Amino acid sequence: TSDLNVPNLQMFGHTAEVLVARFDPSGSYFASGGMDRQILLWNVFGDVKNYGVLNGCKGAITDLQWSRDSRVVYCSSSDTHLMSWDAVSGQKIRKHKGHAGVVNALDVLKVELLTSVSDDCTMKVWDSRSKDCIKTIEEKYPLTAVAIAQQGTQVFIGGIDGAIKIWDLRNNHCSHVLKGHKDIITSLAISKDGSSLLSNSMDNTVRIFDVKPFASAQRQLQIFEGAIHGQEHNLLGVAWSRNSRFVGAGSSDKNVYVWSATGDLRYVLPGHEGSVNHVDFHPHQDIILSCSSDRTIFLGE
Amino acid sequence: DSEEQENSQSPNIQPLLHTENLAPAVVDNVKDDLIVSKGGNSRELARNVPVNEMVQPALGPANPFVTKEQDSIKNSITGYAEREYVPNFVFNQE
Amino acid sequence: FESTYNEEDRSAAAQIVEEELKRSGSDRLENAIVAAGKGEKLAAIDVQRYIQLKPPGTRESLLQSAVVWEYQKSRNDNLYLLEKHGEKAFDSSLEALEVQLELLEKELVNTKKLSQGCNRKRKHYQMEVGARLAEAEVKFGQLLQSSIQCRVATL
Amino acid sequence: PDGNLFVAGLENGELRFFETSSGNELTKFGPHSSPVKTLQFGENGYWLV
Amino acid sequence: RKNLTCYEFLYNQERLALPNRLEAAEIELSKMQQIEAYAQQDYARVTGQN
């Protein structure tokens, strides 16, 4: 039910655990990276072969993000750095330094703005060329995931506390928190319209929150069980469909969980040998991407 | 005094246009799902399939001659063993 | 179509449509003549007086005797012919009848299968679009609530 | 005015609508009460009183 | 054969008709989104004091 040559395509490569794999916003490419300090670029349609390797990172690629231009790549490194990789030529454009620990998550903006969190209990906003953090937010406990609204004033940060904090960059008024979780938040994701927030937490519950200035209280739309986290404290991702009607998540029980966003589980398809780190959906067709700590990633329907 | 003929006969096969379809619609999908999923065998299933038909019944009279040794599925003589990509630190600490 | 309706709703819609209705608004010649005849049945009549077997009389009795004798001779000839061969032709007629029965029913069940397939695919498409329409209307209702609640909340 | 049909209300409120040429009743409009005193058609063709 | 051809007719009429229903629903979604966007931006000017 798509343009893939085979409905299921197991993808081999890497020499260690793969931690992230995100589709190109155009929908023709996607890159993956992990503990082998290398980023691989793929071809969604055709021979599905490697055309580029992004060598030079001195740490595990904890997270990476595609650019809207789909020509530069931003990577998050465990070595307290953020590099910008020119996808077409594979050269180091800039290396953003300034954290004080392993930088866990990364996100890009609709306008050339970068955000990230690290174990130094801080969040930093980066301009694509300034090479320095324009704004710094300091928290008590290490943060683990971010999501930026494409409108461009709100960032959601999630850490040890278990309560998502919504920060307005201009206002610096933080008196609004999406309470409800009771353990470490592994990942966050924003909807295509920027109206809903998707969260995963190590208390084994995947919840969905609404990003709207007004709410009728209990901003909690619904919660999802089944996707469970192991004892390795891995950061398991959540994903949004192109039409924003299916929500997805990975689990440490080697199963990929797909929901209908209405509270009913739809796909529980297995297939991985280890913990499933990341999951994504293709922006055009009905493909799903799987990313697991067994050196392998799977293409979907 | 109502138009019984114009309404009763009209919905005769019109209900069948809704009721007859439900009869064999549960036949083509039942065998196709098994053919696609079991065509890939228990290992390496090839068709991604929604969850609710994952109960996967054996559909038999449950042979009672079997004893407790063969009730279990195994590769080796002693049990079932399969690969698992556990990082070293978690295995060691637990 | 996918819906849960009472027949009372059907009656109500039928009365609406009939209210709107009220407001808005070969043959040959021999065959035609005999048809104008037999429209009231009027079964055609032909002479059946060859069984009365007239007693000794005028030329009608002799003519009748001769015609009965000749019809009887022809009848005997036809029966002797009929059992010169027997019911073998009857066996062939039955075999052809069975052939036609099976030949018809084969394409009958084929047509049943084709119609059922069309119905199944119809039900699949209609059900999926109907589910999408239901989710659309539910989201629209919740969205109505959100709009009115936010607008009053502005105050 | 076209001369193809006409209308004639009745005492019980019903309206006798018949084609002028055919001369057969094909419409009854009975939503009114009391004897309808009068009815007159318009001239543009689509205005009635 | 009667019902088979009739079901073919119903298939054609549904396939023609339903996309129009979908388009109408999507246009309704678009307009409702616009008025909601304006309302929530009003509440956001309120939120400027938060």
Next chain:
Amino acid sequence: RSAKSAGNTLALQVTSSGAVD
């Protein structure tokens, strides 16, 4: 009754109407 398969399966009536195989 515990005899199991102590002998070859008896010849099969093949699908070609061959009485025995």
Next chain:
Amino acid sequence: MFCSISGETPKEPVISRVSGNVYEKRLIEQVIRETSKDPVTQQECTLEDLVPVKVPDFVRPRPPSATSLPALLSLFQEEWDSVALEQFELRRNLTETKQELSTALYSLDAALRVISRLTKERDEAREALAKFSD
């Protein structure tokens, strides 16, 4: 084994080339005499387009009473009456089906007018709701 025109058993069936169907000689010849074509396919047809095929032919076992005489003239009369009755039962049925089709078509047009009026009422009602949201 059954001609598409009258349903009788063709003792000398023939097949066409544009559309091979079991047809009988006299009927197709008279059709060509009326119009030199085949109304089934709306195409020109000639005498040579039919081929004399070989069949064992279908025997007709006579009834117990069939030896010319009344055993034939009475049955001929009765079968005449029966085919006549069928002729009426199919004419009047044609006429009734045409009246019913006309009535149903008028009702369908009325339903189309109804869907139109209810659709404009719908559109304006939903717009009224949306503007009430203001």
Next chain:
Amino acid sequence: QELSTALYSLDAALRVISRLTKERDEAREALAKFSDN
């Protein structure tokens, strides 16, 4: 053929009218309640 076609299209249009008027009167009552306050 045409008779069955017309009759079944009439049934379909009848169901269209039924659903349309049902949700329409529901929406009108909803507006009436909403506009009351």
Next chain:
Amino acid sequence: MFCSISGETPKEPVISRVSGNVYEKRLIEQVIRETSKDPVTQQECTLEDLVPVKVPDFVRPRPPSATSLPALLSLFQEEWDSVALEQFELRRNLTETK
């Protein structure tokens, strides 16, 4: 009802256009595949020259036993030729006797 190619009855009959013959689909397509020729009359034949059966139709079939005016008229004609043959023979005998 009999096939010349194999000698068995055709399970699915087919009539050849070039030469009137009742074949079975497999063997007739076989002989067309091997060459474009007629196995009986050694003349060019093709797949389109093979005519499948469209027996169903839409009219009311009729019984070839009693309810057929052609059958009634054919019985009248057989009686006609029988009495004609009788008259023939007896007239010949009569002129010999004369």
Next chain:
Amino acid sequence: ANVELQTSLGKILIELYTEHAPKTCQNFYTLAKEGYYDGVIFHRVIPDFVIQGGDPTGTGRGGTSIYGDKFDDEIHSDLHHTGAGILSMANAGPNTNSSQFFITLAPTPWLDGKHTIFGRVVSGLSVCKRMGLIRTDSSDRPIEPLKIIKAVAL
């Protein structure tokens, strides 16, 4: 009601209990009429228990009735599994009968519950007795394919 089963080992004849359970036997009757039982493997053979088969997949799963997925079982008192040859139905739940069935090889009194009894094998029981001696692998499945060449109903 009567069906012949042209099986590899021999000839199997079944008379259906239409008078007792009509709904569950008409599907088998018309199913032999349609006859997709051609080339269907008796996937399950257990010494002295059953011979199960009837799924076109051949994987011990599947099988579509005329109703399409499943139907309701009817059982009453006088029916019992007291013999060896009672032809019954295979299910995987409360009312989950499918196109596949099985033949009894020994008295199974415990089984007169969730299983529908709708047949008795009048002739060919020796064929089933021989089927009880067929080479079977670790699971209850014959090594060679025990196909049914044809199933003609009479």
